[PDB]
Design a protein around this ligand. Structure first.
Ligand SMILES: [Mg+2]
Ligand SMILES: [Zn+2]
Ligand SMILES: [Zn+2]
Ligand SMILES: [Zn+2]
Ligand SMILES: [Zn+2]
Lengths: 94, 89
């Protein structure tokens, strides 16, 4: 139905599939007899790898930011002594 | 060259232009700023990063499940579990 098609698209968009990938998934959807699991899995797996890569990138930043946070007292203490500034002057490892 | 190095490091952590601007002001006039200010800027960015990680991990878990159930071979997509899952959500 029209509602089911939108539901299909909605679910794919919720997983972050690109316009290109959703178009391909839709093509498979209405013409499955001429497509395979290798094609559908490839679409999913490529998106999966991009998501995991982005998570790892963010986690690296998360760890550095966490280290920056943890070393600072976070009070009225004069910034002339702030470890955050010292760290950023040296690098981005936190 | 140091100001540019500082900015580079801040950029590597994803700080916004606004946050970098605030950090630079603290850096140049530290005697009139506090650790509370610098830590707040760090926490705002850290929380933004953690929020995005959480959103992505949610997608990752679902995608991983879709991946694992499919044979990924010449098997006709008429039987594909990925398409079935997408229909259901
Ligand atoms: Mg110290
Ligand atoms: Zn302090
Ligand atoms: Zn500090
Ligand atoms: Zn299969
Ligand atoms: Zn399949």
């Amino acid at each position: 139905s029209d509602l089911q098609r939108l539901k299909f698209i909605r679910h794919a968009r919720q997983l972050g599939f690109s316009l290109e990938s959703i178009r391909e998934l839709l093509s498979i959807r209405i013409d499955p007899e001429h497509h395979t699991c290798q094609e559908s899995k490839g679409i999913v797996q490529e998106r999966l790898q991009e998501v995991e890569a982005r998570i790892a990138e963010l986690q690296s930043m998360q760890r550095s930011l966490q280290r920056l946070n943890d070393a600072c007292c976070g009070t009225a203490h004069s910034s002339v002594y702030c470890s955050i500034l010292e760290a950023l002057e040296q690098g981005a490892s936190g």
